[PDB]
Structures are given as structure tokens and as C-alpha cells.
């Protein structure tokens, strides 16, 4: 979605949007990247989750 | 999976020949095959009935190079079939494609015949098979692909299978490397040292 | 009404068909009245492509059963041979 609802399909280089589809709630300051490779993204996220639990 | 590692500690632990090298040089003059592997090798350690049954099953499995789950499947099929499962298990083990390729002299050992079969170099009924479990039936004609007929491996394997004993149940056509499976070899065609009664006893518990 | 149609069995990308006489408002693979043969889209080797009971098929067609399009074509092909 864009600012005032009305869902859109693309988002340009400096447009704030609301994305819907993550598994958990992130925290502010985290950066997002488009991976375009399902397996790589999933395994990297699992590795990051393990490191997060360990550091906690 | 597959057992890949030192293929001679198995002979020492089982205490029999248990062919795993090519048999070219010897067995005694490679490993001093009179002691169990490991630090505690000189100890004898007489073992119990369950130990004897386990050793017999392990010896058969390591001879034919199959893992435990496939072996349980073989046992279940032998029990299902008619006529004395004890030698039914051997009938069924002696019909695998890798074992048949080994008996025909195309490979030096079972591992090398598995290498040949898995790498798409064998045709059974004029068409390629690469499963080292294909139960060949009586009357099939195991051959070698024409693009794979000039490998040296087959040359040494044939010239060394020339002297190990006459199988007398497969006819190998040496000049062009084509075989024939007349029938399954009966119990009297194999070595009379395996006590398959121990295997049947072990699984019936 | 009462129809004659194909019930699908077999497995993924390997279809097998039973020629079944069913009340039309049943599931494709649900309850039926009678099976009158089969059809094999792949066959090959010793497998037969299709087999039908002539007697049962004629009896059910005489009782007012409407075959599907495939059942009509396959039944006329079987009657041809």
C-alpha cells in the first residue's frame, strides 16, 4: 500500500510504502533487500534468526 | 548411501577372505589379516550367540555391499516367497545387476562394477540400465555400450577374472564383451561356509 | 440423469480411467452403480488401451443412460473393432 491506502503495484526509488507479507514484526532501522532467490533468502534468514537468539 | 572407506578392516573384523580388493596380489601380504582392527587387536574375546548371528549377517552384507534397510526388504521378500527363505535370500542377492556384472568379469570388484553400472555403461536387454539393484531375470544378455567397450578397466577385469574359478552359470563372450544369465545359481553353486540359518535366526527375534 | 463417464485413477501425469455408470449428481470418483470397463491413455507393451463390456454397455444404453463425449467416442471405437 501507499500512504493513504489504495493498494499499488510498484514503488520507486524514494517512495515510502507499507509492505504486507512478512512472517514476524521487524524493528525500525532494519534494511530490506530484494533477493530474487527463495532458497538463499530463507536460509540466510534462518542463519540470522539463530544468531539473534544466541546473542539474546 | 554407500560404505566408502577402508575396505580391508571389514575382512579382518569378519575374519574371512570377504573379497573386497581385486585379488591381484594377495590378502595376507597387505594387512596381516589375523587381528581385529584397532588398538585392542591381539585380544581374542570369544563372543555370544547373538554375536555370532550379528557377525554372520554383517559378513553377508559386506560381501554384497548393501545397507540394512534394503537387506530387510530382501529378507521380507525371501520370506514371502515359497521354498525355504534361507537360500531364497541368497538367490535374490545373487541376481543384482552389479553382482552379475562382477561375475561376468567386467569389473574387478563389486565397487568397480557398481561404478560401471551407475555411470551408464551397461545395457541389459539392449537398453541402458543404471540401477545397481535391478533383479536380472533368467535369459538376459548383459553387454557393454560400444562407446564404453575400449575402457582398460574391462580389459584388466577380464584377464584377472580368467583365473578365479568357473562360475558355470553365465556365459561371457570375451571378444566383444557380451554375457548371458542362464539362471539363478543354486545353493550348491555358492561357498558352503555362510550359515544363513544364523541370519534367519537373527531376524526371527 | 444416469450417465456413463470416466472416473480418473492412476497417479500424477499417469491417468487411468474406469468406465462407470453413475447418477449424474455424484462425485467424479464417488459412488457408482456399475463399472463396465477401462481406458488406458498410455498403455504400451502388454497393456490394452481400452476394454468394454458389450453386454452391459448395450443393456445400460437401452435403459436410458447418456454417455459422455469421450465415452461415446471410445464406445464407438470399441464397436468398430
Amino acid at each position: 500500500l501507499d500512504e493513504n491506502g489504495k493498494p499499488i503495484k510498484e514503488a520507486g526509488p524514494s517512495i515510502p510504502v507499507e509492505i504486507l507479507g512478512l512472517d514476524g514484526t521487524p524493528d525500525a532501522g532494519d534494511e530490506m533487500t530484494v533477493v530474487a532467490d527463495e532458497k538463499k533468502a530463507r536460509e540466510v534468514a534462518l542463519f540470522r534468526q539463530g544468531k539473534f537468539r544466541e546473542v539474546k | 548411501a554407500r560404505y566408502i572407506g577402508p575396505k580391508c578392516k571389514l575382512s579382518r573384523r569378519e575374519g574371512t577372505d570377504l573379497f573386497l580388493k581385486s585379488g591381484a596380489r594377495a590378502l595376507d601380504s597387505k594387512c596381516k589379516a589375523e587381528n581385529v582392527p584397532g588398538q585392542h587387536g591381539q585380544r581374542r574375546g570369544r563372543l555370544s550367540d547373538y554375536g555370532l548371528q550379528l557377525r554372520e549377517k554383517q559378513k553377508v552384507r559386506r560381501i554384497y555391499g548393501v545397507l540394512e534397510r534394503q537387506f530387510r526388504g530382501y529378507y521380507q521378500e525371501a520370506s514371502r516367497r515359497k521354498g525355504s527363505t534361507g537360500e531364497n535370500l541368497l538367490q535374490l542377492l545373487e541376481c543384482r545387476l552389479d553382482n552379475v556384472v562382477y561375475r561376468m568379469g567386467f569389473g574387478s570388484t563389486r565397487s568397480e562394477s557398481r561404478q560401471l553400472v551407475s555411470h551408464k555403461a551397461i545395457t541389459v536387454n539392449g537398453q541402458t540400465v543404471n540401477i545397481p539393484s535391478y533383479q536380472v531375470k533368467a535369459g538376459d544378455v548383459v553387454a557393454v555400450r560400444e562407446k564404453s567397450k575400449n575402457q582398460l578397466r574391462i580389459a584388466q577385469a577380464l584377464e584377472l577374472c580368467g583365473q578365479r574359478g568357473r562360475v558355470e552359470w553365465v556365459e561371457v563372450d570375451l571378444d566383444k564383451k557380451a554375457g548371458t544369465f542362464k539362471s539363478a545359481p543354486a545353493r550348491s553353486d555358492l561357498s558352503a561356509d555362510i550359515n544363513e540359518n544364523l541370519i534367519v535366526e537373527l531376524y526371527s527375534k | 440423469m444416469v450417465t456413463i463417464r470416466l472416473a480418473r485413477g492412476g497417479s500424477k501425469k499417469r491417468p487411468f480411467y474406469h468406465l462407470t455408470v453413475t447418477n449424474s449428481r455424484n462425485a467424479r470418483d464417488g459412488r457408482f452403480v456399475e463399472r463396465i470397463g477401462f481406458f488406458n491413455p498410455v498403455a504400451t507393451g502388454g497393456e490394452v488401451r481400452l476394454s468394454v463390456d458389450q453386454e452391459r454397455a448395450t443393456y445400460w444404453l437401452g435403459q436410458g443412460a447418456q454417455p459422455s463425449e469421450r465415452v461415446a467416442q471410445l464406445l464407438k471405437d470399441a464397436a468398430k473393432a
Binding site: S14, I15, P16, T33, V44, F47 | - | -
Partner: protein, 145 residues
């Protein structure tokens, strides 16, 4: 294809991470441990068998004794992901982002409400901002975030 007697020394492929013990380094070098420590007594500050040694000096001492040294990454997934994700060409201009900061009641919400004509300061619990707000507006000149 029989036995050919080896002539020269023995060379291995030592693998080193972020840190390593001297004992482990000697083990991957197929040399006695006490030798390696001795080799430190002849070159700078010595070490002990069990002391945790770094990666740079580990690679240096492994290459000094004629061995092929290949190291590993402690977090190789991140470098593998980052490497094959950032490669592009082309460049275009973009609308600027701007933030508005100040003291409590100096009027930073009212300025944005005039620029956008949105009157959001009328709401808001307590008449204060407690959330960061991000807007994309078409001003009289161009687009601004």
C-alpha cells in the same frame, strides 16, 4: 603404476579461521607441536602450545614453512549473498528526502500541515507527535519526501 619413493618435503593444505590454537595449527601441518613453539623463539615474541593465536600470524607461519594456505569465512553466507546481489548500471535523479527536527512546541507539524494541507495536528493525543511520519508530496516545484 607401482610405488614411487617420494623425494621432497611434505606439503599440506592448512585451513585457518578467525583464530586457531598452536596445537591445531601444528596438527594440520603434520609437525610436532613443540617444534612450532620453538620456531617462535627464533622469530620475535614466542608463544605457548595452548594460547589462542590470530589469523594473520597463523597464515604467515604456515606460509613460512612452505604450505598451501587457504582460509575460510566465519559468516560466508553474508558475503556470498552480498556479492551476487549488488551489480547494476544506469543512473537517474530522485526526489529528495528531508527531515524536520526541533524543540517541543516550535511548530514542525504545522509547517508540514501547511505544505501538504492535511491538518493532522488537530488530532494527536496530547497535541504532541509520538510517531515518525513519512509522506511523499507534490510541492509547487517538485516531488519531496
Amino acid at each position: 603404476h607401482g610405488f614411487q619413493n617420494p623425494t621432497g618435503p611434505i606439503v599440506r593444505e592448512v585451513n585457518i579461521g578467525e583464530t586457531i590454537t598452536v596445537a591445531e595449527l601444528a596438527a594440520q601441518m603434520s609437525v610436532k607441536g613443540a617444534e612450532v613453539v620453538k620456531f617462535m623463539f627464533k622469530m620475535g615474541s614466542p608463544v605457548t602450545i595452548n594460547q589462542v593465536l590470530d589469523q594473520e600470524t597463523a597464515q604467515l607461519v604456515a606460509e613460512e614453512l612452505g604450505h598451501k594456505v587457504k582460509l575460510v569465512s566465519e559468516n560466508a553466507l553474508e558475503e556470498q549473498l552480498a556479492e551476487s546481489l549488488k551489480f547494476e548500471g544506469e543512473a537517474v535523479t530522485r526526489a529528495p528526502v528531508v527531515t524536520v527536527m526541533g524543540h517541543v512546541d516550535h511548530g514542525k507539524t504545522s509547517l508540514l500541515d501547511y505544505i501538504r494541507r492535511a491538518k493532522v495536528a488537530a488530532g494527536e493525543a496530547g497535541g504532541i507527535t509520538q510517531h515518525i511520519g513519512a509522506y511523499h508530496v507534490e510541492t509547487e516545484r517538485g516531488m519531496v519526501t
